Paper text:
In 2011, [name] ([name]), a component of desmosomes carrying four extracellular domains (EC1 to EC4) has been reported to be the main receptor of HAdV of serotype 3, 7, 11, and 14. The critical entry step in the viral cycle is mediated by the adenovirus trimeric [name] and more especially by its distal globular domain called the ‘knob’. In the present study, we investigate the binding mechanism of the ARD causing agent HAdV7 to the EC23 module of [name] using biochemical and biophysical methods. We report the atomic structure of the complex solved by cryo-EM using phase-plate providing improved high-contrast images.
The trimeric HAd7K appears decorated with variable amount of extra densities confirming that the complex between HAd7K and EC23 might have a variable stoichiometry under the conditions used for cryo-EM. Extensive 3D classifications and refinements indeed show that the complex mainly exists in two forms, i.e., a HAd7K trimer can interact with two or three EC23 modules hereafter named HAd7K-(EC23)2 and HAd7K-(EC23)3, respectively. There are 40% more particles in the final 3D reconstruction of HAd7K-(EC23)2 than in the one of HAd7K-(EC23)3. According to that statistics, it follows that the main stoichiometry of the complex by cryo-EM is two EC23 modules per HAd7K trimer. HAd7K-(EC23)2 and HAd7K-(EC23)3 were solved to 3.5 and 3.1 Å resolution, respectively, which allowed the fitting and refinement of two atomic models using the existing X-ray structures of HAd7K and EC23. The overall root mean square deviation (RMSD) between HAd7K-(EC23)2 and HAd7K-(EC23)3 (without the third EC23 module) is 0.5 Å. Each EC23 module interacts with two different monomers of the HAd7K. Furthermore, each EC domain (i.e., [name] or [name]) interacts with one HAd7K monomer. A small loop in the [name] domain which contains residues S175 and T177 interacts with a β strand of HAd7K through putative hydrogen bonds with N190 and N192. For the [name] domain, the main interacting residue is R316 which fits into a pocket formed by two loops at the surface of one HAd7K monomer.
Numbering used by the authors:
A (entry chain A), C (entry chain C), D (entry chain B): 128 to 325
B (entry chain D), E (entry chain F): 100 to 330
Write the structure that this text describes.
């Protein structure tokens, strides 16, 4: 089965499943994530879609920095109370999340051998960088710097794997104005990491 | 009366005018060259084989003429208005089934103006800028910022919109832009005692009055211009 | 079979299979495309090879903008009369296209749920950006901006999926001169999208 | 088996397995490489970890240019005496290299049809470019330009496939100073190529 | 006669000269240091253990000497000619099986010049530029553009090639380049009535006479220099 090789948020969820900003009292954006087992790597495919007006208002400022925390247990299941994404990942059922349990969720995780916790001599291996874009309302692409950070922190003894994705820009002008700000949609971003054993 | 090559394809008008915009993508319609047949339709004379004879700024193969319909397009060589503001295309439509001989046939004229887009950032020419104020000074235009935009002098892609990055918190100054020269005329609205021996240091961000285009937005990183005003 | 997971133009076709420029009366370049089903994503792998002298002459100018249209029917088969690529895609048979029909061609398409047609509120999700390069005759890499555009247009009622890839540069000097212009070969470009169901 | 789809150096080898610089008398760095068969492509995943003090001293200079040569025989097995990496690749066994022989190693190679040897008319198809980063000791990312070069040279009649990866930077300041230089770790880099038949 | 350590490895010549190019990749051959054995070959004295003693510009470990063959290479630390134009390498080849004692052995001298490549873009130093013309004025050199390239003064990587971005459509001016100072000497070929009160505004793109290198081509984005000539 090629459905169990993918762990992902759904395609266009009917409601917002992520709470990026702590100022938001509920979920304020749609987070689209996709993890695909590529041999010994994971092809990780992530972008966000803004939902709440405060979240979509971000395009009107010039210095934006928002991050998504994904904390995972010892089995690979998402810790929803601590993570930015408040809806657990699942396998592939068409364009939708599956409904059952997770079959070898631990294989999707960033490996601790490649990415250790709290090893200062091996600090630099946990960092992944890249760039996505934001298409403006006049079809202008604004590059957004992405920093991906693997297995840095355990907030408790429960957290075993950590993925931090941080979008940020420092542009010259704001991408939009208050009247033209419609939705914050980032272009998709793809990165890889060495995955943990099954 | 047969459809022999006995007449000419009658044009609509001799000096055609049309327009297309700077930095357009390939295969963008510029005009449809209107012409008619003086013989019967659905014949060889109805086959109006339009044919470009001479680009007068000939060097880049920018425009493409569709020889079947007369529609004039833009090729994959992208137009840059700041090197060729206008194109003259001596076209010459020919009847018959495409026989290219020295039988003279009607020549039209196609004049194409290219419409400027704001694909250039204004640049501050001078690098040291300084003004002087005394007691009870107001409505003083002490310094003018010289900017240089390349987008069609007189247009909103060329006028400079100035804004204060920092330093004008009390509302001392207010910048107006000359349109005859595109100058950074500052003004003075608040009076400062020169015996206070203070400073009125500030900086300006310069941009065009119209918004920038596709390719230079998201690359526009404005560095402030440190104008120093000794008191 | 791992051959049916790939939909692609062949490797180095014996003749030009693409007509990028409308000024060309026949096929003027070789288009190399590869679509690989990666779980719920498609790893799309595209670049062009110039063939005709007018097409290879493009390297001598500074402002180049050419695009490839790929229109696909309701079943995923390429509409050759409307598309830039005039030879239909097929599965993998060595370094060559297969000869049979297409087995689940619809699974390779950009999904309409992720990429809808004519939804202005969801306009920004259809855009994908990136960068390829052109190695000059003196082994200088000139970056070429790529914009990929998914499911924008149906030219008729027949077209169900659309992929537009646009290469463009605005350099300071031309990459070549008339004597040194040999071939326009772009470096390969890889992008992903959420694929349509089978 | 999904283990045989990956050909790779191990994760964090216990000793340095690569000799990048010829001035080094022994292996001076850890080279991490991963090749994953992605349909008709190979997802190639490479970065280096500095080991020797002379190698880690490179971060204190501003103009750095080091390269890794990978030469492979007619069967795909690494020629260790000629290559930079002195330990042959193997399949996946957890976080470690496998111990057996290689099952269809030839399928991982850069294809000669797509990437020919000594064809001057098709020179430009052998070049792949990209960018990785070096996280500084103060968590500053310094972009490193990568040039990947496929099937250029046969040093003898034995070499059938060649992969050259070259890291290089020209920064304004050195990333580190002599006291702060700890380890040269590059961020991972991912590129693709059309693979040779099995 | 045995192969005891009784003599010295005889060199070819004392002050060696060679050359290597700027921005070369790692492990590029610079020379092969020629030396011979005064004892029998295939012995311990035939083991000519070449050994660098002193880089005179010692700070970057740029060159690598292969102690078996005497071949001198370039390390992963890339050469930049504009900070060290030449290197002096006091080498000292030693016979025997590598015994490093205070027995004095022959010292050679290796002088290495680095060959400049055009890895620097010329920059226009002045920022405001202006010229003046009157009636019947021709062959006037009214303004000179000061440029600044860093690539080996006197070379074609350093001379400036000027070209007109815009404004010189009628063929008014023609720029010649001084080689003694690398100046932008313009000239005047067309006569303009000053009582016409017109303008001769134009702009110049500056580049080196030789083509740019690998790393600064595709990053060379020339902004025009708005030279203003009042009539």
């Amino acid at each position: 089965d090629d459905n169990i090789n993918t762990l992902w948020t759904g395609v266009n969820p009917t409601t917002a499943n992520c709470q990026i900003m702590a100022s938001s009292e509920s979920n304020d954006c749609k987070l689209i994530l996709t993890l695909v087992k590529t041999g010994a790597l994971v092809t990780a495919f992530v972008y966000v879609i803004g939902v709440s007006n405060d979240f979509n208002m971000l395009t009107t400022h010039k210095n934006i920095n928002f991050t998504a925390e994904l904390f995972f247990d010892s089995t690979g299941n998402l810790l929803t109370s601590l993570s930015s994404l408040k809806t657990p990942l699942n396998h592939k059922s068409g364009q939708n999340m599956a409904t059952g349990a997770l079959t070898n969720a631990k294989g999707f995780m960033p490996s601790t051998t490649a990415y250790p916790f709290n090893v200062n001599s091996r600090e630099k291996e946990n960092y992944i960088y890249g760039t996505c874009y934001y298409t403006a309302s006049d079809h202008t692409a604004f590059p957004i710097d992405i920093s991906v950070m693997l297995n840095q922190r355990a907030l408790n003894n429960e957290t075993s794997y950590c993925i931090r994705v941080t979008w940020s820009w420092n542009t010259g002008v704001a991408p939009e104005v208050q009247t033209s700000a419609t939705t914050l949609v980032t272009s998709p971003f793809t990165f890889y990491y060495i995955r943990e054993d099954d | 009366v047969l459809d022999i090559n006995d007449n000419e394809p009658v044009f609509t008008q001799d000096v055609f005018v049309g327009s297309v915009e700077e930095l357009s993508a390939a295969h963008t319609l510029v005009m449809k060259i209107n012409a008619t047949d003086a013989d019967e339709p659905n014949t060889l004379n109805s086959k109006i084989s339009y044919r470009i004879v001479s680009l007068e700024p000939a060097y880049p193969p920018v425009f493409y003429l569709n020889k079947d319909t007369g529609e004039i397009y833009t090729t994959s060589v992208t137009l840059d208005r700041e090197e060729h503001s206008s194109y003259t295309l001596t076209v010459e439509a020919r009847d018959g089934n495409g026989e290219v001989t020295d039988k003279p046939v009607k020549q039209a004229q196609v004049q194409i103006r290219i419409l400027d887009v704001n694909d250039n950032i204004p640049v501050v020419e001078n690098k040291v800028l300084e003004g002087m104020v005394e007691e009870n000074q107001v409505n003083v235009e002490v310094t003018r910022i010289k900017v240089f935009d390349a987008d069609e002098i007189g247009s909103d892609n060329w006028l400079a919109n100035f804004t204060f990055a920092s330093g004008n918190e009390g509302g001392y100054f207010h910048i107006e832009t000359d349109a005859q020269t595109n100058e950074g005329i500052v003004t003075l609205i608040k009076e400062v005692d020169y015996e206070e021996m203070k400073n009125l240091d500030f900086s300006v961000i310069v941009a065009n009055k119209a918004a920038f285009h596709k390719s230079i937005r998201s690359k526009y990183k404005p560095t402030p211009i440190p104008i120093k005003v000794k008191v």
